[PDB]
């Protein structure tokens, strides 16, 4: 999950 929600973030920005 950390890396999942993480990745979110990185790719939305």
Do not use: H, R, S, W
Request: no cysteine.
């Amino acid at each position: 999950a950390a890396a999942a929600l993480a990745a979110a973030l990185a790719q939305a920005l």
